[PDB]
Amino acid sequence: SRRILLPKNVIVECMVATHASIWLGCGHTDRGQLSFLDLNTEGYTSEEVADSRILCLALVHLPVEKESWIVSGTQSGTLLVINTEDGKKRHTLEKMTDSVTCLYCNKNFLLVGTADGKLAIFEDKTVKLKGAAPLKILNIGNVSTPLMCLSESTNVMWGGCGTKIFSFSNDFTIQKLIETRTSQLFSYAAFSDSNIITVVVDTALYIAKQNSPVVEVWDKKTEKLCGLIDCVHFLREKMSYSGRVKTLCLQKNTALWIGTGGGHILLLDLSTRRLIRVIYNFCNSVRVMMTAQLGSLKNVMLVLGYNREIQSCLTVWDIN
Amino acid sequence: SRRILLPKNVIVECMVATNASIWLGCGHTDRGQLSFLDLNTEGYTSEEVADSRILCLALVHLPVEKESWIVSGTQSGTLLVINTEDGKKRHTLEKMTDSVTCLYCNSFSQKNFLLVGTADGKLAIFEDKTVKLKGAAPLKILNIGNVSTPLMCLSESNVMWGGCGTKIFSFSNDFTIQKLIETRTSQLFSYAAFSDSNIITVVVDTALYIAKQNSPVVEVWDKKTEKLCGLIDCVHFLREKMSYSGRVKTLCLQKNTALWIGTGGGHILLLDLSTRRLIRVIYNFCNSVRVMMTAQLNVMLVLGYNRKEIQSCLTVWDI
Ligand SMILES: O=C1C[C@H](C(=O)N2CCC(c3c[nH]c4ccc(F)cc34)CC2)CCN1
Ligand SMILES: O=C1C[C@H](C(=O)N2CCC(c3c[nH]c4ccc(F)cc34)CC2)CCN1
Numbered sequence: 001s002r003r004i005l006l007p008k009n010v011i012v013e014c015m016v017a018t019h020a021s022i023w024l025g026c027g028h029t030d031r032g033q034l035s036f037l038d039l040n041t042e043g044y045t046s047e048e049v050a051d052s053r054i055l056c057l058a059l060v061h062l063p064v065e066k067e068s069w070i071v072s073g074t075q076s077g078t079l080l081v082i083n084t085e086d087g088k089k090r091h092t093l094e095k096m097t098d099s100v101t102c103l104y105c106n107k108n109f110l111l112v113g114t115a116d117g118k119l120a121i122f123e124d125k126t127v128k129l130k131g132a133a134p135l136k137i138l139n140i141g142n143v144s145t146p147l148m149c150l151s152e153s154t155n156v157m158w159g160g161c162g163t164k165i166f167s168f169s170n171d172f173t174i175q176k177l178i179e180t181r182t183s184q185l186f187s188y189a190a191f192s193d194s195n196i197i198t199v200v201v202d203t204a205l206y207i208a209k210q211n212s213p214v215v216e217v218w219d220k221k222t223e224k225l226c227g228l229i230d231c232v233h234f235l236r237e238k239m240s241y242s243g244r245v246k247t248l249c250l251q252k253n254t255a256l257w258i259g260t261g262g263g264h265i266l267l268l269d270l271s272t273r274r275l276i277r278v279i280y281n282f283c284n285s286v287r288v289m290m291t292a293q294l295g296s297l298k299n300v301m302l303v304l305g306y307n308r309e310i311q312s313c314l315t316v317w318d319i320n
Numbered sequence: 321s322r323r324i325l326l327p328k329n330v331i332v333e334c335m336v337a338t339n340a341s342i343w344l345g346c347g348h349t350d351r352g353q354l355s356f357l358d359l360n361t362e363g364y365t366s367e368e369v370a371d372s373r374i375l376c377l378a379l380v381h382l383p384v385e386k387e388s389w390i391v392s393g394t395q396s397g398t399l400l401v402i403n404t405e406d407g408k409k410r411h412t413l414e415k416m417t418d419s420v421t422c423l424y425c426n427s428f429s430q431k432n433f434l435l436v437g438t439a440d441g442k443l444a445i446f447e448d449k450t451v452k453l454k455g456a457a458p459l460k461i462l463n464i465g466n467v468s469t470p471l472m473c474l475s476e477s478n479v480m481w482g483g484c485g486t487k488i489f490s491f492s493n494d495f496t497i498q499k500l501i502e503t504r505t506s507q508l509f510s511y512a513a514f515s516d517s518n519i520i521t522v523v524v525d526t527a528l529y530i531a532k533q534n535s536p537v538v539e540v541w542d543k544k545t546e547k548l549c550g551l552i553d554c555v556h557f558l559r560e561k562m563s564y565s566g567r568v569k570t571l572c573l574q575k576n577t578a579l580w581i582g583t584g585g586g587h588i589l590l591l592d593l594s595t596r597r598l599i600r601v602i603y604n605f606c607n608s609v610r611v612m613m614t615a616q617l618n619v620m621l622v623l624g625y626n627r628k629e630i631q632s633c634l635t636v637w638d639i
C-alpha cells in the first residue's frame with residue numbers, strides 16, 4: 001500500500017486512471033478543472049478546460065485508430081473530449097439538456113447519464129467527431145430524478161435512476177425497471193426514499209442510497225428485496241458512527257468493499273454474509289473506491305479519501 | 321401524567337395492576353418479596369412471602385366463586401397463590417421443574433386458564449378453578465423448547481401466541497402447538513447477531529411484533545404466511561446523541577394501530593402501525609424502561625429506573 005497526498009484544499013469530484021497516472025475532475029472550483037497526478041513521481045499539474053465543474057470522467061480508447069480520448073462531463077451538460085496524447089486536439093460532443101451525472105464505457109459505447117434522468121449513447125467512432133450527436137437518448141426518469149450510476153456483471157447493463165433500478169441491452173431499450181422504495185417495510189423509510197448513488201452487479205444487485213448506511217440487496221430474477229446490509233450495526237459490533245455509504249466496490253467473486261462518510265472501510269464476504277475486515281478511521285471520509293488496470297496485468301485498488309482546510313489522499317494497493 | 325417514586329433501592333422484576341393499586345415482585349433481593357403500591361396514596365408495603373425471587377405475577381379473578389388470587393412465580397419454580405382480600409389464605413400449586421419465567425391469564429370459548437412458562441421451555445396449563453387448590457397439578461404440560469430456551473412471553477389478539485427461544489409458537493382451545501416459526505431467518509434483512517438472540521416480548525395485532533434480547537430491532541412477522549414482513553430499527557428512529565443503543569426492553573400495543581417501544585436508554589417511541597410513521601418520541605423519559613403495560617382503571621403504566629443506588633419510578637397516564 002502507498003498513500004499519495006494531493007496538494008492542500010484540492011477536492012476530487014471524479015477520477016479515471018490510464019493504462020501510471022490518474023485524471024481528476026476538481027470540486028474545489030465552480031469552473032471545469034482537469035488535473036493529472038503521476039502515480040510514480042507524485043507530480044500534480046492542472047488546467048481550467050471547461051466553463052463549469054467536471055462531474056464525470058471516462059477514458060474512451062479506440063484500438064483500430066490507436067487513439068485514446070479523455071471525456072469530461074460538466075455541470076452545464078458539456079461533453080468535453082481531449083486527446084490523451086496531444087492536449088491541443090480537443091472538442092465538445094452534443095451538449096446534454098442537464099448536468100452530466102454519469103459516464104461509462106461499454107462493439108463499444110460511451111454511455112452518458114444526465115440530471116433529468118436521460119441516457120445518451122455514443123459509439124467509440126463518434127467520440128472523435130466535433131459536435132457529434134448520440135445514436136439514441138433514453139428518457140428513464142424526469143428532471144426530479146438524476147441518472148447517477150451504471151454497472152455490469154464482471155451483454156446486460158444495470159443503472160440507477162432516482163429510486164429505480166433499470167436494465168438495458170444491445171437493443172438499448174429498458175427491460176427491467178424495479179422500484180426500490182418498496183424496501184420501506186424492512187429498511188428505515190428515509191433511507192428507502194433516497195436516490196440510488198451506486199450499484200454493483202454480482203449474483204444480486206447491491207445498491208447504496210444518498211445519506212444512508214444501508215446497502216439494499218435485490219434479486220435480478222424475482223425483482224424483490226432479498227437482503228439488507230446496515231453499516232451502523234456492522235461498525236458498532238465509536239457508537240456515534242453515521243455509517244453513511246459513499247462507495248460500493250466488488251473485488252473478484254463474493255467480496256464487497258464498503259467505504260463510509262466517517263472514513264471507515266468494511267470488507268464483507270457475500271458467500272458467508274460475514275464481515276471479514278474493518279479498517280476504522282482509514283481517513284476522515286472515504287469519497288471514491290475503484291479498481292484500475294494500470295499496465296500489462298497490473299490490477300490495483302484506488303481509494304480516494306479526505307481529512308480535516310481539506311487534505312485529499314489517494315491510497316493504492318495491489319488487488320490480490 | 322404523574323410520577324410515583326418507589327422507596328430508594330427497590331427494584332421491580334414484575335407488576336400486575338388491580339383505590340387503583342399494583343402488586344410488585346422485587347428484584348433487589350434473593351428471596352420472594354411481594355410489594356403493594358396504592359396508586360392514589362403512593363403508599364408502599366411489602367412482605368417476604370417465598371424462599372426465592374418472584375420473577376412473575378398474575379391476577380386470577382374467579383367472579384363465580386367471588387374471589388381474586390395473586391399468583392407469584394419464583395426462581396425455584398414455586399407457584400405461590402395468595403388471596404388478595406385475606407393474605408392469610410395462601411398455598412402453593414405443584415412446583416415447576418425450573419424457574420417460572422412467564423404467567424398469563426387467558427380465556428377460551430367459556431373457560432379461563434393460568435398459563436405458566438418456564439426457563440426449561442415448558443408451558444403448564446391450569447384451569448382458573450384449579451388455582452385455589454393446594455398442590456394442584458396442571459391440566460397439561462407442553463414441551464416447546466429445552467433448558468437453554470426459556471418460555472419468556474405469552475400474548476393474544478381466540479388464539480394464544482408466545483415466544484420460546486428464537487421460535488414463535490401458536491396454540492388454541494385444544495392446547496396443542498399449531499404454528500412454530502423459526503425467527504433466526506430474519507438474518508437476511510436484520511443484523512445476524514440480533515436475529516440469533518432470544519425473544520423477550522411478543523405483541524399480537526394484524527402481524528406479530530417481536531423483540532429480542534440486546535437488540536434495537538423489532539421483527540414483524542406475518543401469522544398466515546409465517547414469513548418476515550417488516551423490521552422496525554429503533555437506532556434509526558431515534559437518530560432521525562447519535563450514540564443511542566436503541567435496545568428494546570418493552571413493547572406495548574395501544575388500542576387501534578399504535579405501538580409503544582421502551583428502550584434501554586430511557587426513550588419511548590410511539591408508532592402508528594397503519595401509516596408506519598412515528599407519532600411521538602419521549603427522549604430521556606427516565607434512565608431505562610423496564611415494563612410498559614395497559615391497565616383498565618384506560619391507563620398506561622411505565623416502570624423505569626435511574627442509577628451503588630437505584631431509584632425506580634412508576635409513571636401513570638390516561639390513554
Ligand atoms: O439472488 C439470489 C442470491 C442470494 C445470495 O446468495 N445472496 C444475495 C443476498 C446477500 C445478502 C443478504 N443479506 C446480507 C447481509 C450481509 C451480506 F454481506 C450479504 C447479504 C447474500 C448473497 C441467494 C438466493 N438468490
Ligand atoms: O397481516 C399483515 C399485516 C402487515 C402490515 O400491514 N404491516 C406489518 C409490517 C409493519 C411495519 C413494517 N415496517 C414498519 C415501520 C414502522 C412501523 F410502525 C410499522 C412497520 C406494519 C404494517 C402486512 C403483512 N401481514
